[PDB]
Amino acid sequence: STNLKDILADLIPKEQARIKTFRQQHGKTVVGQITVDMMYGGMRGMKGLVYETSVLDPDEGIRFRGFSIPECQKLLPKAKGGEEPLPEGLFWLLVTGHIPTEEQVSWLSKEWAKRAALPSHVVTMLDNFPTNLHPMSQLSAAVTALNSESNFARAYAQGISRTKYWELIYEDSMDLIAKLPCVAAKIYRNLYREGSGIGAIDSNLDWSHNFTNMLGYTDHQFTELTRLYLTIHSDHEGGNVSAHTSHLVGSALSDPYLSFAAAMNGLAGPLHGLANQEVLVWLTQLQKEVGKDVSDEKLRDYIWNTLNSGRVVPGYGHAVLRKTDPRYTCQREFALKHLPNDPMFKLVAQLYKIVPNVLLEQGKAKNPWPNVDAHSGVLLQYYGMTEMNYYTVLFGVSRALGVLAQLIWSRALGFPLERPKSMSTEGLMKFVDSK
Amino acid sequence: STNLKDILADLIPKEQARIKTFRQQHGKTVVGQITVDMMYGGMRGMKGLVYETSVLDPDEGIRFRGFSIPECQKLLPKAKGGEEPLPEGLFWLLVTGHIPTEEQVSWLSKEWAKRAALPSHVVTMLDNFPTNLHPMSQLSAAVTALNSESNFARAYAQGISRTKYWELIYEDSMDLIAKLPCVAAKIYRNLYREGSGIGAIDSNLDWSHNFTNMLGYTDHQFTELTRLYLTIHSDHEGGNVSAHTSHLVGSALSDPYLSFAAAMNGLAGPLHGLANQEVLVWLTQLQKEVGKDVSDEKLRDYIWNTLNSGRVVPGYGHAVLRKTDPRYTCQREFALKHLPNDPMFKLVAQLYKIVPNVLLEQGKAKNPWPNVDAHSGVLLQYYGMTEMNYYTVLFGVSRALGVLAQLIWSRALGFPLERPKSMSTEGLMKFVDS
Numbered sequence: 001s002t003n004l005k006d007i008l009a010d011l012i013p014k015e016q017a018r019i020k021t022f023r024q025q026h027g028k029t030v031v032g033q034i035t036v037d038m039m040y041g042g043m044r045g046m047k048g049l050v051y052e053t054s055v056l057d058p059d060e061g062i063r064f065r066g067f068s069i070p071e072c073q074k075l076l077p078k079a080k081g082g083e084e085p086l087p088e089g090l091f092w093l094l095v096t097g098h099i100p101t102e103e104q105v106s107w108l109s110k111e112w113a114k115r116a117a118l119p120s121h122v123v124t125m126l127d128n129f130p131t132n133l134h135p136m137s138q139l140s141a142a143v144t145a146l147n148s149e150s151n152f153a154r155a156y157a158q159g160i161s162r163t164k165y166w167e168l169i170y171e172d173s174m175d176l177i178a179k180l181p182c183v184a185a186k187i188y189r190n191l192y193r194e195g196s197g198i199g200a201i202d203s204n205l206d207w208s209h210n211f212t213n214m215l216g217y218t219d220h221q222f223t224e225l226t227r228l229y230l231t232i233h234s235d236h237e238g239g240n241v242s243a244h245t246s247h248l249v250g251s252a253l254s255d256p257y258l259s260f261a262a263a264m265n266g267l268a269g270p271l272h273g274l275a276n277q278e279v280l281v282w283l284t285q286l287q288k289e290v291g292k293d294v295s296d297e298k299l300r301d302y303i304w305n306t307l308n309s310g311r312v313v314p315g316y317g318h319a320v321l322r323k324t325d326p327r328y329t330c331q332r333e334f335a336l337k338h339l340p341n342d343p344m345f346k347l348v349a350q351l352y353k354i355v356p357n358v359l360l361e362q363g364k365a366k367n368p369w370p371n372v373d374a375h376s377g378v379l380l381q382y383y384g385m386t387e388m389n390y391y392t393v394l395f396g397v398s399r400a401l402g403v404l405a406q407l408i409w410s411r412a413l414g415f416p417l418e419r420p421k422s423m424s425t426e427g428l429m430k431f432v433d434s435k
Numbered sequence: 436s437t438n439l440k441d442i443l444a445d446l447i448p449k450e451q452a453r454i455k456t457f458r459q460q461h462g463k464t465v466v467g468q469i470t471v472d473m474m475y476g477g478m479r480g481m482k483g484l485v486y487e488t489s490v491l492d493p494d495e496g497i498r499f500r501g502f503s504i505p506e507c508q509k510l511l512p513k514a515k516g517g518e519e520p521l522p523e524g525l526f527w528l529l530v531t532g533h534i535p536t537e538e539q540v541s542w543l544s545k546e547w548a549k550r551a552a553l554p555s556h557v558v559t560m561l562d563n564f565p566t567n568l569h570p571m572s573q574l575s576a577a578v579t580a581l582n583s584e585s586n587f588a589r590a591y592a593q594g595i596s597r598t599k600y601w602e603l604i605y606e607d608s609m610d611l612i613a614k615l616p617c618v619a620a621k622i623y624r625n626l627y628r629e630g631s632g633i634g635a636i637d638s639n640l641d642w643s644h645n646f647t648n649m650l651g652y653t654d655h656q657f658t659e660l661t662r663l664y665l666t667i668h669s670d671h672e673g674g675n676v677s678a679h680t681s682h683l684v685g686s687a688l689s690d691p692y693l694s695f696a697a698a699m700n701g702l703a704g705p706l707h708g709l710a711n712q713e714v715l716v717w718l719t720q721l722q723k724e725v726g727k728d729v730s731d732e733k734l735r736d737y738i739w740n741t742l743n744s745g746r747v748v749p750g751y752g753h754a755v756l757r758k759t760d761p762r763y764t765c766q767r768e769f770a771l772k773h774l775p776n777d778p779m780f781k782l783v784a785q786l787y788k789i790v791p792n793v794l795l796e797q798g799k800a801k802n803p804w805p806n807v808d809a810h811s812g813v814l815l816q817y818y819g820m821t822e823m824n825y826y827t828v829l830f831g832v833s834r835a836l837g838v839l840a841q842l843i844w845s846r847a848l849g850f851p852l853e854r855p856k857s858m859s860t861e862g863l864m865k866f867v868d869s
């Protein structure tokens with residue numbers, strides 16, 4: 001009723017039968033072809049894996065178990081007095097496929113606050129990391145080191161039924177999620193607040209608020225942003241590098257700690273994890289050059305110049321997104337409400353109205369709309385989080401929610417080891433001369 | 436001309452042009468189909484990626500740049516007074532596609548010797564890790580922490596050309612390889628030799644010998660087994676979890692340290708790199724339950740009893756292979772030579788005599804033959820390396836050579852982000868109905 005573990009135990013047999021029915025009906029059905037190009041092209045547009053938690057709706061953007069961001073914004077419980085969905089409630093939705101009640105989100109906050117304690121060796125490790133070790137590497141290493149607490153690692157050697165794997169994955173996942181804000185905040189403080197203490201977890205606060213307390217922030221609106229930020233970056237299908245990495249490492253029966261730590265290594269990749277930062281570096285450089293009261297005309301000209309130099313507008317480059325990423329839009333609406341006077345926000349909204357058209361005029365993408373990362377950096381900066389090296393850590397804490405929700409389900413459903421076939425160029429040249 | 440980096444610079448254009456042409460003509464040739472079962476079956480049988488260094492024949496087993504392991508044992512340089520191929524030469528072969536000269540292997544030994552230094556924060560982290568932190572976690576966290584020495588991360592931030600990624604990938608790879616034995620030896624000593632120091636690197640020893648020196652071993656035949664172990668575990672195609680993880684993370688332009696440390700997390704999984712220990716624990720439970728004397732009938736029985744109750748013989752199957760793993764056969768030949776009277780060895784050999792038939796008669800064995808992990812533990816244990824938690828660390832050190840060699844080529848050839856399409860069961864049902 002209130003215990004997520006017992007609700008999930010009741011959901012797992014129905015989903016297992018659903019899948020078994022579909023495989024028994026359609027197992028041998030061909031869903032696509034693999035070309036030589038796809039093998040060289042990083043499996044692009046190859047249906048490679050099953051991932052239950054989120055799906056890209058090609059018009060309406062990401063869907064969390066069927067719910068769009070606007071629907072989640074509407075339906076998910078909020079803090080007392082807040083407007084922004086609690087990430088707890090998003091996690092519940094991912095795991096259960098159902099919208100939580102306020103009582104379920106509240107139980108989940110309490111459960112995460114009670115598991116949040118870090119082992120001493122991790123605190124020590126973190127306190128001893130130098131300033132030149134990037135925050136993401138500190139997060140990954142710390143998470144790896146947390147695997148000393150893994151319930152799941154012990155039990156496989158002990159011969160626990162496969163049928164029970166999901167239960168230990170759940171425990172480990174709940175423990176990791178609870179601990180991630182303490183790790184993330186200790187890294188923040190060590191790097192940027194002279195190693196002062198993160199203080200104490202409040203057993204009665206939601207996860208985002210405990211997290212902002214620990215970072216050393218005391219600004220209701222930043223906590224509101226953080227709630228929204230963690231909700232919306234939580235999951236984006238299974239194909240992206242951080243989700244795929246967690247799924248791949250997870251399929252070897254590595255515990256949630258090792259899976260996530262691997263996934264963060266992947267998120268730290270500058271083709272996955274650095275866009276927030278590149279957009280902000282660009283905006284800062286732009287505003288300083290052209291001043292904060294630049295005209296549309298002069299802005300449009302600057303953009304035309306950048307494009308004709310063979311250069312991209314960072315944060316504008318879409319997939320199949322026939323509209324603006326709803327992840328952008330909810331950040332925009334947030335900004336419109338709470339920081340409409342901010343100069344850099346004003347530059348962001350001005351580009352929004354100008355750049356799509358310029359991109360359509362040019363021979364480029366048929367989608368010229370902005371991704372989530374075009375708006376994220378200006379909001380964080382506004383609330384005093386100016387340490388751009390740390391931005392991807394926030395993304396990472398968010399993504400824990402999606403990849404761990406899916407990891408529980410991968411084990412509950414008994415997905416096997418991910419083990420595709422590779423070929424060399426020489427092999428593939430022969431393979432095609434034959435047949 | 437002589438330096439590995441220069442020889443590689445000459446080879447890259449040629450391979451790039453040859454692929455550009457291949458994808459022009461044959462880019463649209465279908466190599467395979469995707470079925471629903473493959474999506475739910477972890478991509479089994481699905482031609483997913485290009486991986487240049489090695490290719491796994493299901494029937495004949497692994498080839499390194501077209502060379503079987505027997506071919507490598509013959510052709511690859513050995514230490515002076517040695518019979519086992521140097522891992523250095525395996526790496527040269529993976530990187531260049533060519534068998535190295537003794538001079539080239541000697542040069543590479545010196546090169547990894549000179550790069551082996553650990554920064555102080557990494558030493559300290561290892562010295563502070565508690566005893567209950569698995570050695571593989573230790574290895575992963577230390578490698579991730581070494582990413583502070585990444586020249587590739589620093590160069591990419593300054594906007595280096597795409598055409599030059601492979602060069603810094605190579606430097607960071609050569610640095611990681613050189614440092615790994617030091618990291619690995621520190622783990623070992625901290626956990627199992629009460630924190631005793633690892634000593635120093637000798638610049639005129641090969642990589643496997645410096646490593647056994649740092650572990651605390653002084654046994655020619657132990658060094659020989661290591662040289663063998665580190666060659667044959669080095670690479671196994673792109674599709675295994677450790678190589679695929681490194682390739683996936685690397686595709687996002689993560690540096691070799693983060694890519695390798697991700698791989699290690701994958702190698703640490705029970706279905707991947709912990710089978711060595713799992714084999715050994717099982718053989719030990721078996722050896723106490725009958726003893727040295729057990730007959731083919733008794734053993735055949737015990738096996739039947741195991742299968743009938745739906746248990747499994749550890750080390751006797753594979754996702755891809757469907758004959759005796761050549762890496763098994765290599766270790767069998769070592770053992771036959773250097774420890775034929777070892778009781779544990781005796782049991783493993785009896786099992787080779789018996790189990791493959793039991794599995795074929797039954798019928799549900801897609802691969803009835805042993806894989807590498809059936810044989811490796813008894814060799815290690817025989818030389819005093821009885822700390823079974825640590826075995827995957829050796830595999831890890833070995834696997835660094837294959838995945839880092841491929842990572843240099845993945846950047847050199849400009850392989851993009853790996854980004855397959857995922858589906859939900861609900862979405863997949865609807866797509867199939869369309």
Ligand SMILES: O=C([O-])CC(=O)C(=O)O
Binds near residue numbers: 233235240241
């Ligand atoms: O960027 C992508 O490809 C999807 C994703 O991971 C994200 O939304 O962050």
Ligand SMILES: O=C([O-])CC(=O)C(=O)O
Binds near residue numbers: 675
């Ligand atoms: O190839 C596989 O899937 C597993 C394996 O034997 C290896 O990585 O050495």
